[PDB]
Amino acid sequence: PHEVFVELNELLLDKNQEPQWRETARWIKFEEDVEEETERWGKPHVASLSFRSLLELRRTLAHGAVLLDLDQQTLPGVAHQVVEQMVISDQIKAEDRANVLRALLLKHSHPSELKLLEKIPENAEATVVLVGCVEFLSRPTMAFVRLREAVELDAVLEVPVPVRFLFLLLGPSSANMDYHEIGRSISTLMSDKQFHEAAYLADEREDLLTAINAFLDCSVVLPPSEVQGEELLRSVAHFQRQMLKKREDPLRRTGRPFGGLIRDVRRRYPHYLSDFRDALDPQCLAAVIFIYFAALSPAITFGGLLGEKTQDLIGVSELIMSTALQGVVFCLLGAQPLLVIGFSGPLLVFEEAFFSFCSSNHLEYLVGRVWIGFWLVFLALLMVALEGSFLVRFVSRFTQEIFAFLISLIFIYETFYKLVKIFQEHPLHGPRGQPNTALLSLVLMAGTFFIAFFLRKFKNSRFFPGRIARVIGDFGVPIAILIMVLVDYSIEDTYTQKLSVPSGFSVTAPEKRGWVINPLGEKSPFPVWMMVASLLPAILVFILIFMETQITTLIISKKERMLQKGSGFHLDLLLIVAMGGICALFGLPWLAAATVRSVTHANALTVMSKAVAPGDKPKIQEVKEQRVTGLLVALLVGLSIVIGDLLRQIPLAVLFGIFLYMGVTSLNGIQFYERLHLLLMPPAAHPDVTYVKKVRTLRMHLFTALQLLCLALLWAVMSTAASLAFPFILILTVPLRMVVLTRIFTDREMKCLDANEA
Amino acid sequence: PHEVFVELNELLLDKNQEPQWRETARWIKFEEDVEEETERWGKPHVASLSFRSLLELRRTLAHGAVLLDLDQQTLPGVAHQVVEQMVISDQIKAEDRANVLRALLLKHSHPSELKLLEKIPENAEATVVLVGCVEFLSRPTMAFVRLREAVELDAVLEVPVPVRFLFLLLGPSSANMDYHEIGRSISTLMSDKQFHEAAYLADEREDLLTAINAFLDCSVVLPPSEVQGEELLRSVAHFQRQMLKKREDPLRRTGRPFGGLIRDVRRRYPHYLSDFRDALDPQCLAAVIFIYFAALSPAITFGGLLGEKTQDLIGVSELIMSTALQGVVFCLLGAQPLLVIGFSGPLLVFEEAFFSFCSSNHLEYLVGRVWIGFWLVFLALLMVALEGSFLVRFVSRFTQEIFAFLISLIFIYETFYKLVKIFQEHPLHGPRGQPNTALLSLVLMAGTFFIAFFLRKFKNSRFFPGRIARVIGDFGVPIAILIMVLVDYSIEDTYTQKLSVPSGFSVTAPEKRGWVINPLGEKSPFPVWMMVASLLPAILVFILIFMETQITTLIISKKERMLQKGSGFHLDLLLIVAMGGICALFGLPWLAAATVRSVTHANALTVMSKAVAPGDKPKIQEVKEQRVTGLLVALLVGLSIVIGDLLRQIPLAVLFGIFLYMGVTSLNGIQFYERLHLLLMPPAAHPDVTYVKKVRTLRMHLFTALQLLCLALLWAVMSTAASLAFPFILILTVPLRMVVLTRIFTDREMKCLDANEA
């Protein structure tokens, strides 16, 4: 089976009023049409035919000329043999054979070479369709030629490809046939996957006719009624699938303890040296630059906020080093260095939720986190030993979207509650009570949000090339902070709460904390009941780390990602938590492998294949798969503590704008949020999605109501004094979905509403 | 020719495990398919067929049964006659005739009546397609029945329509034919405009077969290659037009002086009493409510700004009365009461531009406008007398889009220059010098912009029904002002510049001005050279009124608007200017018939026809065409001066936010702005628009550069001391387009780049 690039060049008059063949269309995949007015190739489109043209093609092909395995290699000699064969079958009178021969030898023309060769598959044989209105003849005349050898004909094609099938059609007008449409019909057949397969094996004129019928019976005949909108033709794609259908792992559990750890070590580690060679490509150097701002910006927005929530015990300087200390050690030893380890959003809403519990019960907060670390290590060892990392299968779209919607509700609430706090501390009247502090904070808070919100749309708009914005992922955030910091920097005599960052490798609050947190009680003795009961917070933390890291590994290890090298589930979970349990001893926060950063890292290294035919979705040729982009990003984040002066000038109102921005944008893409929109829209206006078409409106609104009810239970718990339990309530939905929603919704509805990939 | 509603109900098993015909699709126009999973009718779509099904239909129809002019009216009797005719032609054995008869008489079923009757044309005759898999037969069997009389059959259709054509098909499986697809093929043929026309006149089985060929030869045969995106199938609509194509005034000038005035008086005035009767419909009462906020909100945003630009000589109170004084008199006497007369944007940028000239040359500003009024009256009489209102043909998309883009540049600039003025008068430090005044003004200015900007998107989003938002046009502006006024109202001890509106029918600045401006000089004598040279500003004003009113009358008088009553060009131009020349004597501003308000008024009264088949674009059945909605809106605006306390609490920073909002949104829809976007995007990403497809990229960028160069000439003039001349420079583009761009661009390119309607 050979791929075919079929070119239709028609006999037309040039600007010099001379007859010459001009390329009118070409078929690599689908069809591209020359616009005579502008001499520009049109956008690729489905080669729609006219049934009258196909009927005329079938009529002329019967009693037509046939040149099979023509042992000729020169266009003039081939043309002379074609004319002889045509006059054998009485198609052309011997008087006009000279004129037909002269018409065959005319100079071909094209609108304009290396670029187009890339799109066509390398091992392809082109088909030339010579169709034109000839005046000296009185009857239409056709000749299908199959060359014995793939001979690159003499300057006949726009792109030099060995010509295999030569198609000739020369007939006068007034025959009620459009030769331009007959040329498109025969060219479309030759580009068809199965029609040319019958052309290679064709042995008689009847066989080629039978090949047409095998094409028509697989076709779609539209009616002559016109089309008013694109939604009318949306079902044509779905119907065309029905017609053709009628014609036609790391999570595996082994009994060996630490078995998943051993397999993942034996998979990626053999490619350790290869992990450093693949980094020499210049695309990796662009990944370091554009991901460094994707891993540093959330390191200060969460680092700054932890400075307020935890009274500067854990601030930016600790989160900067914790991101760098773990980011380097993970890349040097992890099985998936494409993961960007960082302080996830859900972990932030736990530290704020755990600080209140330690503040209420008169427990040292930092020492209370040391003992969570000692129990995070034990649970991580226990789970990896028993290979219990396959439970991420049960965490499905019902639980993920409830969580990702609850967090985005917290981010929106926490800024607006911070904003209300500012106005109550700095009321509008003619440090506390500072004029212009409340409003400038609102301007900065709403300045970075709308700058970053609109630049995200500009990223996704038609202005930015897809090949570029894939590499540079979410650059609105770094520039929004830079712009509004300078806006606040220019202002003088007005106080805005600045980021609390001390210069040098020092604690954010040196007077209150030391580098090594004493596990036995820093200032006051630590109660012996809490060091044993810290397992309960540790399980709740471990759920937030296990869910965030293992889901992320699932997202980037899919076959669509084209990750050739081994991806490790067990080895990453152990490192992310065993470092998190040891980084807690030094007061540094524990981290998870965030999904948004990791995909931004994975996308930046995806190399889209150049050999894509026009009109086809780009396919990921490969991914760089190196340990250096993750390593350098980790080191550069750690070196951000060198600029402690620049970070100290970032207003805290600027970060809350980004904090609100990340809350709002994370809603996009969540089916829970999308199905909340449908709760307001009328049933007629619901979009044609899988969960909408195959599920009736009433059942869909019941499913969304249950998710919304399961989200109000989480919010009620979070506002009470037992806010630590929201990880446990969250994974009560997994028993709920697998047991309660199983008997309410049929398997058909759950397969549509809870889809692993969609 | 009868419209046909063709229903395909197939023989299928019910939830009771009993055989009964179930409606699977219906064809009023295009096709709607029953989704078996949810029992919901799918969205209308083109009835795409499979060529195998059409071939099987043609095969079975040959040697098939034919019942033409069957003189029967009962479904059991018709079925028995059909069975007799089928067994005559050996299609069904006499042994199985009882089973076929039993299968014909089965109870039909449908998913669910008055609503669907509206969509179908009233005088229509339905076609029933009975297709099902019958097991007791060994061969497929078909019977096409054309009833002699249009008999509403016994509960056979979902919607009771007199059945004319009855189509029967009963055949076993294993015949390599999908009866559901054969049923869709025959149903699609019957719904075709020309196929059933041959069915009514059909006289033999051969004739019906020939009718199929007349259908296929007008069809579009898609290839079996799948479709990846909707842009692939976008060309299918364009190609389908080619296939079918191959098969197939008030501006008039008369020699009589004031001739246009007489015709327009003799056209609309006879319907004067009808203009008041048509207003009793409840839709008119909704127009008054929703347009009152569309005519009042720009009356204060321009009224407030004129308070600053003209030092409160002409403010809100004068613009409110001028809008009401002219709005009432125009509706009582104008030939097109659908016009909403109001202070256009271009007139605002002249009063600001004319005030500077009067301030620089030591001329009384208000007296200087009285003499422009006396010369506006004379020019209006002169133009209407000579019927020179046909010059609006020459003001084309080249001049309109240059103007509408220049103004939107002024609106954006004027707010940002006001905002800079506030900060320099109220600097940020720990009336003048007021703290919190500069930032709160920015918050209010950016508050109303983003509230109104996002609510405009919510208006156009899928959430808001199209039938509603057409009635309620641009309601984001009234609610944005209301929300941010309350936000500023709650604030205390902070000063924001409030609207300057005195309560009662009083001048905005009583100490400086009187109600009647003395034409001979109010305080100081008016120079006798300026009262004669005021013709020069009068011509420049008259261009801004003529261009804005006559273009608006063109926009709403198009045939697509379905304005049955006479629309007047000459009578409106005379009234709008002759009142404007007389309203200037009292210090009130002159007004034009704004396009945006008028279309918002015209749309609110358009009654969309209920008798629209599914999938068709709604057609405007009629427009109310009354003089009362315009009258009541005018009176309600005048009564807004009663609430002088409420208007006095609107901050001037709130209005500048709306002022900026109207500048930004007016850019949308302008091809000049759209072609500026293409100047940045690569040629591959250019949208498939008429001026893009038929004009090469280099020539299009030359045309846009010329427009951008012609916009920089206007801005340079406007920033100089002769800012009054921008009306004259603007209509220098009409000679430029008709003379200079004629020789640069071919008529093919100008027909695409400058399209009157697109």
Residue numbers in the entry:
A (entry chain B), B (entry chain A): 320 to 431, 503 to 638, 673 to 854, 894 to 1221
Copied sentences from the primary study:
Anion exchanger 2 (AE2) is an electroneutral Na+-independent Cl-/HCO3- exchanger belongs to the SLC4 transporter family. Both the transmembrane domains (TMDs) and the N-terminal cytoplasmic domain (NTD) are involved in regulation of AE2 activity.
Analyses showed a strong density of the AE2 NTD which was not identified in the AE2IF/PIP2 state. The mutant AE2 TMD also adopted an inward-facing conformation with a RMSD of 1.704 Å compared with the TMD of AE2IF/PIP2 state. Because the substrate exchange activity of AE2 harboring the R932A/K1147A/H1148A mutations was significantly reduced, we designate this structure as the AE2IF/REST state. Aligning the TMD of the AE2IF/REST state with that of the AE2IF/PIP2 state by gate domain showed that inward rotational displacement of the AE2IF/REST core domain is greater (with a RMSD of 2.280 Å) than the displacement of core domain in the AE2IF/PIP2 state. PIP2 densities were absent from the dimer interface of the AE2IF/REST gate domain. Without the binding of PIP2, the intracellular half of TM7 shifted 6.2 Å (distance between Cα of I935) toward the core domain and the loop connecting TM6 to TM7 moved upward away from PIP2. Loops and β-sheets between TM10 and TM11 of AE2IF/REST state (missing in the AE2IF/PIP2 state due to their flexibility) stabilized the interface between the NTD and the TMD through several electrostatic interactions (between E508 and K1073, K348, and D1079) and hydrophobic interactions (between I347, F349, P363, L506, I510, P511, A1074, V1075, A1076 and P1077). Electrostatic interactions formed between E356 in the NTD, and K1157 and R1211 on the other protomer further stabilized the interaction between the AE2IF/REST TMD and NTD.
